[model samples]
Every structure is written in structure tokens, then in C-alpha cells.
Target: MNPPPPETSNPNKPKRQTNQLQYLLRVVLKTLWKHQFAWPFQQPVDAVKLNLPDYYKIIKTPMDMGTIKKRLENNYYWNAQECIQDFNTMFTNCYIYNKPGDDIVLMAEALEKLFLQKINELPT
Candidate 1:
């Protein structure tokens, strides 16, 4: 998404197709869920324990190390299902509205929720 726009397209600004962003989000979410959740063990215990969808990986996102790192480091979902709403709203005016101050606030909320959840999950 960094290449300059073509002469035929708008030449003043860089343009991105955005077709891949959705796919990248889908795959990223599924993978995150797999890594965080375990399915009911079936015939074996040591085997791979993943369930997922297809047709969601062909496209791509500009998921550079920085972007992915920020996302991973910013995690706050109680679980995979809890991730859907917020993740979808991310980078949208509906949630962030292109502001850094709100991001700081978002960081606080997620961090506190994560900390509380960790306490509840601690081994008795």
C-alpha cells in the first residue's frame, strides 16, 4: 500500500486497493483464536486442535511488523468472540475517529480488563 498511484489513477496521493485488508483481518482473527483457544479433544490429545474457515486467506493486508506487533501487544479480548466488535470498529471513525488521545483511553480500558480477567483465570 506504499507505492505511488499510477498516472492513470490519482497522481497526487498514494492509493491502496483495500481488498486485502478485509482478508488479512479474517485470517488474523482466526489464527489468533486458534492460538488462544483449544477445541474439545477428540480421538487424540497431541494432535492439532484447530477449526476454521476458508476463502479468507487469498487476499492480504499491509500487516507489517509494526502493525501486527501493535495489534498483538494491544490485545484485550476476553476471548475470540469478544474480539469481533472492537476489532471491526478499529481504525474507523465509529471508534477511534483518528485520534491518539482516544487510543490512550482505549489502552487503559483493555489493560484493566485483561488484568482482571487474568486474576479470575489464575489457578486455584
Candidate 2:
């Protein structure tokens, strides 16, 4: 019988490490979900309650953490980048709708900072 060839130990990219990415996503998401500032952005905006008549017109693509969480649960994200972009979109929509000094705006910024700090440590 022929002996098996030795393995090459050269550096290689570990493609398709999605399990790790999703695990990190869950951890980071839970932490963000627990934050006090998370309240405002947790749910979708209520246009009627707030009387934002032109909100949908101005914000073409509205996003919120609740929707992100739902998407994560449904395995809608193929990669960490997609999940991260959704988060950024949520914050961006809030910024577009509200002024800098608004409570929701400040809260979104704080939550965004925390999210960035946590996810920046993720493996690329």
C-alpha cells in the first residue's frame, strides 16, 4: 500500500466560517438588546403615533433592531457584512428622520457606537 503524502502547512484562508459569525452575531445582538438606549430603536417607528406623515416618503428604506433580530432568527443574513449593513441602515434611517439633538438620535448614536465596539473585534 502507498503511504499518504504529508500535508502542506502554508497559511490558508478559512472560508465559510459562518457558524462563528452567527454565534458572534447572537452574542453582540443580545448585548445591544440589553442596553438602555436600545429602547427607541428596538421597534419600528410608529408613523401614526408620532404623526410622521412624510416619514416613508423621506426615508425610502426604514430599518430597526427588531427587524434585524427577526431576520437573524430567520437566517436571512448570508454573512456578517450583511448583518452589519442592516444595523448601519437602521441607524442611518434614524439620523435622516430626526435632528442631532433629538433623544432618539442620541440614543441611536450611543447604541451604534457600542455595536461598533463589539463587532470590531470579530474575525474578518
Candidate 3:
């Protein structure tokens, strides 16, 4: 029997921008904190709630705000510096994965906002 035909892209499918952004943030966070996840804990909790000092102990040299800002600006030049600047501002202002009571949901929300803002700032 012949193999089934490849599935075609569905134009009518509702685009999930939030889902995509959340997935992207998860990947980034996982890569950045893989070492942290290797350790044992009495009770499991969101990565962000583990405390910044403890997290830092595992993943030394976490992405610095300035470096991330520069990298994003250099890598995605489609948006003007304004977009980069806005992201940088948010990165600094928002409580990141380091803050108390933090969780994946919080990080994902911040990332979504930043992504949407950048996309909106892109030139036509």
C-alpha cells in the first residue's frame, strides 16, 4: 500500500499567536535552566518559584538584560530600535522568572506582551 498523502496546511485554522509565544518562551527558559531542573527538590514547584538565588546557583550567568536586548535587536532587525528599546524596558521593569510567586504563566504572559508589542511596532 502507498503511504498516506501529506497533510495540507489548513487556511481556515485559527491562528494561535499566544500558544506560539508561550511555546517559544518555554523552550528558551528550559534551555536556560536545564541545569537547574537536574537537581532534586522535596516538592515540585514552577521553575520561577524556586528563588532567584537558588536558580542562579544552578544556571550561572543567566542571560543579562543588556545582552538579551542587544541580541534581539541585532537578530531581528525587521523592527526598529524602538521595539528593541521597549522590550528592554519591559525586561527590566517586569518581575522575571526570578521574582517571588513567579511561574511559567507569568513569564509566558510577559513574553507574549513583548512579542505582540514588537510585532505591532514593525513597519508595514
Report the lDDT tens digits of candidate 3 across residue range 1-124: 1223212233453323233233323444233324332222112222355443444334322333333334332332222442345444434433443465456436634564555554453223
Report the error of model 1 at residue 3, Å.
29
Best by lDDT: 2
Task: Output candidate 2 Cα RMSD.
Answer: 14.6
How many clashes in candidate 3?
0
| lDDT digits (tens) for residues 1-124 of candidate 1 | 1222112223353433232333333444333334322122111111123221221132122112223323333342223333333333232321232244565345434433443343333221
Number of clashing pairs, model 2?
0
Global lDDT for candidate 3? 0.36
Residue 92, model 3: Cα distance from true site in angstroms: 15
Which prediction has the highest TM-score against the true structure? 2
The deviation in Å at residue 122 for candidate 1 is 26
Sort order, TM-score high to low: 2, 3, 1
2 or 3, greater by TM-score = 2
Q: Flag clash pairs in model 2.
A: none
Model 3 scores a TM of: 0.25
- Provide the lDDT at 52 for model 2: 78
